[PDB]
Each structure stands twice: as C-alpha cells, then as structure tokens.
Design a protein around this ligand. Sequence first.
Ligand SMILES: *[C@@H]1O[C@H](CO)[C@@H](O[C@@H]2O[C@H](CO)[C@@H](O)[C@H](O)[C@H]2NC(C)=O)[C@H](O)[C@H]1NC(C)=O
Ligand SMILES: *[C@@H]1O[C@H](CO)[C@@H](O[C@@H]2O[C@H](CO)[C@@H](O)[C@H](O)[C@H]2NC(C)=O)[C@H](O)[C@H]1NC(C)=O
Ligand SMILES: *[C@@H]1O[C@H](CO)[C@@H](O[C@@H]2O[C@H](CO)[C@@H](O)[C@H](O)[C@H]2NC(C)=O)[C@H](O)[C@H]1NC(C)=O
Ligand SMILES: *[C@@H]1O[C@H](CO)[C@@H](O[C@@H]2O[C@H](CO)[C@@H](O)[C@H](O)[C@H]2NC(C)=O)[C@H](O)[C@H]1NC(C)=O
Ligand SMILES: *[C@@H]1O[C@H](CO)[C@@H](O)[C@H](O)[C@H]1NC(C)=O
Ligand SMILES: *[C@@H]1O[C@H](CO)[C@@H](O)[C@H](O)[C@H]1NC(C)=O
Ligand SMILES: *[C@@H]1O[C@H](CO)[C@@H](O)[C@H](O)[C@H]1NC(C)=O
Ligand SMILES: *[C@@H]1O[C@H](CO)[C@@H](O)[C@H](O)[C@H]1NC(C)=O
Ligand SMILES: *[C@@H]1O[C@H](CO)[C@@H](O)[C@H](O)[C@H]1NC(C)=O
Ligand SMILES: *[C@@H]1O[C@H](CO)[C@@H](O)[C@H](O)[C@H]1NC(C)=O
Lengths: 366, 49, 244
Amino acid sequence: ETKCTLKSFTVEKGIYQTSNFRVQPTESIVRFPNITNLCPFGEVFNATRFASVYAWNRKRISNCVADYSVLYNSASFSTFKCYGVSPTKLNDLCFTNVYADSFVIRGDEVRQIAPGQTGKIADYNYKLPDDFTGCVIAWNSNNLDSKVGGNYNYRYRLFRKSNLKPFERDISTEIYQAGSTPCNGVQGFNCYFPLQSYGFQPTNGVGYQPYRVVVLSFELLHAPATVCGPKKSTNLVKNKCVNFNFNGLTGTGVLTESNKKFLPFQQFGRDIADTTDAVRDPQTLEILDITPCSFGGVSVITPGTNTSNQVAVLYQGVNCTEVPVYSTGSNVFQTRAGCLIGAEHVNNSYECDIPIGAGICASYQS
Amino acid sequence: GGNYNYRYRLFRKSNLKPFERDISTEIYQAGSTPCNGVQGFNCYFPLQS
Amino acid sequence: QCVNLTTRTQLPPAYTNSFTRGVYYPDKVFRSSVLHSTQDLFLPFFSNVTWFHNPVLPFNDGVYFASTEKSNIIRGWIFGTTLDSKTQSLLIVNNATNVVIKVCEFQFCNDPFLDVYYMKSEFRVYSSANNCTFEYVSQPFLKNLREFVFKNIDGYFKIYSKHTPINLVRDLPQGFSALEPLVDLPIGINITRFQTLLALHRSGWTAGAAAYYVGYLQPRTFLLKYNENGTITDAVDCALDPLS
Ligand SMILES: *[C@@H]1O[C@H](CO)[C@@H](O[C@@H]2O[C@H](CO)[C@@H](O)[C@H](O)[C@H]2NC(C)=O)[C@H](O)[C@H]1NC(C)=O
Ligand SMILES: *[C@@H]1O[C@H](CO)[C@@H](O[C@@H]2O[C@H](CO)[C@@H](O)[C@H](O)[C@H]2NC(C)=O)[C@H](O)[C@H]1NC(C)=O
Ligand SMILES: *[C@@H]1O[C@H](CO)[C@@H](O[C@@H]2O[C@H](CO)[C@@H](O)[C@H](O)[C@H]2NC(C)=O)[C@H](O)[C@H]1NC(C)=O
Ligand SMILES: *[C@@H]1O[C@H](CO)[C@@H](O[C@@H]2O[C@H](CO)[C@@H](O)[C@H](O)[C@H]2NC(C)=O)[C@H](O)[C@H]1NC(C)=O
Ligand SMILES: *[C@@H]1O[C@H](CO)[C@@H](O)[C@H](O)[C@H]1NC(C)=O
Ligand SMILES: *[C@@H]1O[C@H](CO)[C@@H](O)[C@H](O)[C@H]1NC(C)=O
Ligand SMILES: *[C@@H]1O[C@H](CO)[C@@H](O)[C@H](O)[C@H]1NC(C)=O
Ligand SMILES: *[C@@H]1O[C@H](CO)[C@@H](O)[C@H](O)[C@H]1NC(C)=O
Ligand SMILES: *[C@@H]1O[C@H](CO)[C@@H](O)[C@H](O)[C@H]1NC(C)=O
Ligand SMILES: *[C@@H]1O[C@H](CO)[C@@H](O)[C@H](O)[C@H]1NC(C)=O
C-alpha cells in the first residue's frame, strides 16, 4: 500500500499515512411503540345481517391500526381482488378515512362490481367510479344468507329513470311507469315496482345462491393519515456497533446505558453542533445513550526499502481492543497516539528520528 | 382473428436488470402457499396475452 | 335549546401589560446548559393584553388565554369560522370528570351557555348536532392562575397548558414559567374566531364578573436558556431593545 500510494517501486525511510480504518455494523434493530389500536374489522366481516344491494351498507372507519395480513391469508373469501394496490403491500400502506360498502347479491351479478362495469345493479343499485381504488372481497353466503323458505327480504333495483352515479345510494320506493299512462301508485298495466325480490335457496345452483360482497376504499393524501398498517419491532442489543431506526430516527452507532434524566415529554436529546446523542425507546421508555463506532487513520513506519523490508503499523486514536495478516502479528503496544503493531517497546532512550507522537517514536535496529 | 401469440411478463419475484433476458415459464406464487405447478389460488401464470 | 340573554352583563375590555409571559416548548428535544435561538410564533415581551372582567374574538394566528379562576367557572371553548352547521366546528369542554373534545357541525344561537342547578346537571349550549368526525375523551385539565396556548398549523391543532398557584391580587405576576405541550389534534379546519363558556349559577343566573386575559401571537425570534435538567429557565426577546 505504501508503494502504491507513493506511486513508486522504492520508498524512503519515514512514516506515511494510508487508508482509513472503520468498524462495520453487525446487525440491525428496529423499535416501535407497543401500541396496537385494533381496527374494527371483525364486526364488518362476521356480521349476521348485511344491507341490501340497493341500500348498500356504508361504514366509515378511522383512527385504527389496520392489519390485512390476517385477512389476506383467509381462504373463506371467494374473491380477493384489489385494483390500484397489490395485496401484498397493503400492510405497508398508510391511509385514513376507510370506507366500506357491504351488501348481499346474487351469484350471477358478482362480476358487476368493478370500475367502469355495466350491468343491472351496477347502474341501478350501486355504482363504482372508473378511478375507483381499493379492493373487493366476496364470499359465498349460501350457508347463512340462504334459507329453505327463501330470503325474499332482499330487493334489487331493476327500474330507474336513469343510471346511478358513483358512490350513490338509491333507496327511493316509488312505482315505475313502463308505458304512457300515470300509475298513481297502482301496480297496473305498465306500472311495476322497480325493486325485485331475491329467490335465494340452498337448492339453487351457481349464480343463484347469495353472496356477501364488500368493497374497501381509501383516500389518497388529502388529510393527515390515521389508519395505517402495523409497524414491526425487533429485539434490542447493547455494546455492539449496530444501526438503529428508533421511531423513524435512523443512525449507526453503539448504544449504552445513560444516567441522564429527560423530562416526561421529550423523545431524544441533542447537543452543541446539533447531533442526536440520547434516545428513549418507544416500548420500555428508558433513556439510552448513543456513541459513534470506532474509526481512524492508519499509518506505516518503514526504515526505507533500501535498508530493510519489514514495516510497522500504527492505528491513530483507536483503543487496543478492536484491532481487526496484521491482526495479531507481533507484540502489540498501546500508546497515547493509538496502537502500534510490529515494534518492540524498550525501556531505554535515544534520539528521535522517526516521530510517532506523545513524546515517543520508533527506529530501526528489528 | 385476434393476435394472442404476443405475450408479456406480468409477475416476477423482483426487478429485472438492464439488457437481461428472462424466458423461463413457471407458476408464480401470489400468496404464502406452495403452488406445486397448479394455477389455482395465489398461483398465476406470469405470461399474459 | 337556548334563550336570548336579556341581562347582557358588561365586561369592559381593559388593557394591561403582558410582562414576560407566553413561553412554550417548541420541540421535543432534550437540551442542557445551552442557549438556543429559535424563530416561531410567540407573544412579544411587554405586549398589550386585553382583559375581560362572552363576545366573539378572532383567532388571528394563535391565542394566549390566561385565567386566575377560582372554583372553576370557565367551561370550554368553541372554534370555527361561522359557528354554524354550514361549517365544521370544534368544541372543548372540561367538567369535573373526563374532558371532551368534539368536532361537528352544530347549531349555535346568540347566547350558548351551560347553567347548573345547585341536582348539579344542566347543559343547553347547542340545539342540533350534524355530521361528527372526531371524538376525544381525556383526563381533567385542572389563587391559581392557569395559562393556555392555542395554535393551528398544517391541519394540526396544538394546545399547551400550565397551571400555577398565585398570590397577587389582580395583575399578571412578573414571573417566568414555560408552557409544556399538552395535546395535539389531527384535524384540519379553517378556524378564524372563537368563543368561551361559563358555569353560570342557575340557582336566577349569577355571573357578572368573568375575569380573564387574552393575547395574540406574532412570528419573531427568541433566545432560550436550558438548565442542567432540560427545563427552560429564561428567555430573551430579539426585536425589543438594542441590547436584546
Ligand atoms: C408495551 O406493551 C408491552 C406488552 O404488554 C409491555 O410489556 C409488559 O411490561 C410490564 C411492565 O414491566 C411487564 O410487567 C410485563 O411482563 C410486560 N409484558 C410483556 C408481554 O412484555 C410494555 O411494558 C409496554 N410499554 C409501555 C406501556 O410503555
Ligand atoms: C480500552 O478499553 C478498555 C476497556 O474499557 C479500557 O480498560 C479500562 O481502563 C480503565 C482505566 O485504566 C479501568 O478503570 C477499567 O477497569 C478498564 N476496563 C477493562 C474492561 O479493562 C482501556 O483503558 C481502554 N484504552 C484506552 C487507551 O483508553
Ligand atoms: C362530565 O362530562 C362527561 C362528558 O360525557 C359526562 O359524561 C359521563 O362521564 C362519566 C365520567 O367520565 C362517564 O363514566 C360516562 O360514561 C359519561 N357519559 C356519557 C354519556 O358519555 C359526565 O356526566 C359529566 N359529569 C358531570 C356533569 O358531573
Ligand atoms: C435537577 O436535577 C438534579 C438531579 O436530579 C436535582 O438534584 C436533586 O434534588 C433532589 C431534591 O432536592 C435531591 O433529593 C437529590 O439528592 C438531588 N440530586 C443530586 C444532588 O444529585 C435538582 O433538584 C434538579 N433541579 C435543579 C434546579 O437543579
Ligand atoms: C371473524 O371470526 C373468525 C372466527 O374466529 C375470526 O378468526 C376473525 O378474526 C373474525 N373477523 C374477521 C374479520 O374475519
Ligand atoms: C541504498 O542503495 C544503494 C544502491 O543504490 C546502496 O549502495 C546503499 O548501500 C543503500 N543504502 C543503505 C543500504 O543504507
Ligand atoms: C523496563 O521494563 C523492564 C521489565 O520489568 C524492567 O526490568 C526495567 O527495569 C525497565 N526499565 C526502566 C528504565 O524502567
Ligand atoms: C395599552 O394600550 C393603551 C391604549 O388604549 C395604553 O393606555 C396602555 O398604556 C397600553 N398598555 C401597555 C403598552 O402595556
Ligand atoms: C363529515 O365531514 C367530513 C369533513 O369534516 C367529511 O369528510 C365527511 O365526508 C362528512 N361525512 C358526512 C356523512 O357528512
Ligand atoms: C379552507 O377553505 C378553502 C376554500 O377557500 C379550502 O380549499 C381549504 O381546504 C380549507 N382548509 C381547511 C383547513 O379547512
């Protein structure tokens, strides 16, 4: 290294500075608060009764820790289809103002729920926008929402003056005229009820048994977010050069115990020439201490390649504890300037030729 | 009659590399369960026409 | 459910000296034996503070609210632009038990008050409650001066509080005490004016002396000194005197 840095095949006697020694991180630690505000998800997927398609149940959820991994792995859902977001990254997405539209429909109209989708209930009962983002979750309800006597309480809108706008609820109960004569609330000729009953029965085949379908929608950066996926936490280490991500504050260093006393509302401390020095862990709520990992410069002492061929190595301002072929080498000496490898400490004294520092220096003899 | 011989990669384990070629066709696991070469649930064909 | 108040009691808008009050922690960073300069919204030293012995007052940018209350006559606050159902409004109440924060489009009349029978239950502030977004329940906040700072920045509503026993008769004491942060709200409203609520003695209402002090906030630079334990022990204004 000396020959390469000096750009020569010969070197003169002296001490020459060379590359830098830096300790590397060992592992990582991630700490986040223990807080887990369970989101109200069970009552909306395990509810006994769901609203009809024309009266789709609209629910607003906010200020919750929402976990979708516990729901993605569920196999009881016939359809698990998200449009604008891939299902794997939902746990890492931060949103707010969650909207849930839940209803029960027939099996033949399950495809009618999609952005830019045409059909009967898509424009007469409930409409989704073309730019709809979120997910749709569907499952069979023949075991529960189907009865041997038939669940005829469910009505779907069939007649309307026009289509339905996105995010529109139509629960109007008025006769519909199919001709050129007034009805006056009489189910006569060309006068029919726009809502038709559902003939859900267990004996019915596919496309006829009831299906529970709920669509989940989010907002995209309009208000401060409060419903976001859970953040995982890791274990804790000590007296080891690592890197940390304490509550979003990241940095590399080694952590020890601190006797400093914060006040009950701060999170971390800083000093002159502002740099973070002490942090409080979000779980145990204790004041730790951060100090940077060891680093320094290395230098080579040589008597000149013309005289001999062996060299000594000095690490500047580094404790003689984390040294690492020259990891053990020969006897090692610890000095006020750092650590010295390849030289023998003697108790005599002579004139100084190759300075080292702190009143000591080295020479050739070994 | 519909050009369907043209297919493109839809799913991958990770990102590609510049001037890299991928031609291997295998079932892609979209969940946390083995596929065993069965295109059912959470197991898709990465080639899309 | 409210009635127009015929006995419009008079609270004269006097003016007095702010002295060196209105210092709050701006961040959440521990410091020790350091002098730190910071530019933010503050109450200027020796400003001129309004004194009331409940009309409408504009919010401006921030509000410093002080009260040497006895027996807790003050009830709460109303925040909004028009204080109607047409605009989202905020309400804060602090009774004997848990304090309540509400965000709805209520219906407000000319004289919203509480009243209480000496049996201690009466509430006739608003008439109808529309769409409600945020609900909050917390611990009660409470010869004893209580100071609070209300701010609204980037859709976040910040309330800082500090209470301390007092012995002076009328004027604000010439002491120093920082206002540690208390509560944050993630609600974004266009608030511009506010109100006040009183605990009138419905026993014939008996409320004629509601003494409190109100000041406003301006953007400027201060210098703060942190003690060994990290508590702000002194502050100095910048644009007050050449020596400053
Ligand atoms: C965060 O939550 C965890 C989980 O409950 C808390 O850990 C408990 O802490 C108490 C207090 O020392 C112990 O008695 C329990 O044995 C701990 N249980 C577990 C499972 O760790 C932790 O204290 C909480 N941190 C807070 C509230 O700041
Ligand atoms: C390198 O680190 C070691 C370990 O801390 C230091 O050894 C300590 O030295 C002090 C002062 O002599 C003693 O009070 C401790 O008991 C020692 N600890 C151990 C574990 O031996 C050593 O001093 C450090 N080197 C330098 C140059 O500071
Ligand atoms: C103080 O205000 C609260 C605000 O709701 C009143 O409500 C009850 O407060 C108690 C104590 O915290 C709770 O246990 C009840 O659940 C609250 N009821 C409701 C409907 O929220 C409380 O009554 C008031 N106390 C008074 C006026 O003395
Ligand atoms: C600042 O912190 C120190 C250390 O906690 C405080 O000193 C303690 O004060 C209490 C109460 O007087 C004593 O019981 C302790 O023995 C003290 N600890 C010592 C001397 O190490 C100090 O009171 C705090 N406040 C100020 C203004 O310094
Ligand atoms: C519904 O009930 C099952 C039965 O244990 C439970 O595992 C699940 O968490 C509940 N909630 C949802 C949303 O499935
Ligand atoms: C330096 O090298 C020369 C050869 O160029 C040699 O004659 C001389 O002895 C060397 N000096 C020493 C070994 O001190
Ligand atoms: C140097 O160290 C050796 C080792 O014990 C000792 O015997 C000797 O006296 C020391 N020399 C001086 C000058 O202190
Ligand atoms: C506040 O302003 C009034 C003028 O209305 C003045 O008389 C009074 O001295 C002022 N108080 C101060 C500057 O502290
Ligand atoms: C209630 O008001 C909020 C704004 O504060 C708005 O986002 C929300 O859509 C409203 N909900 C209803 C049902 O009016
Ligand atoms: C304030 O009103 C404007 C309309 O003039 C609106 O664009 C803005 O979002 C409102 N901000 C808040 C915080 O309500």
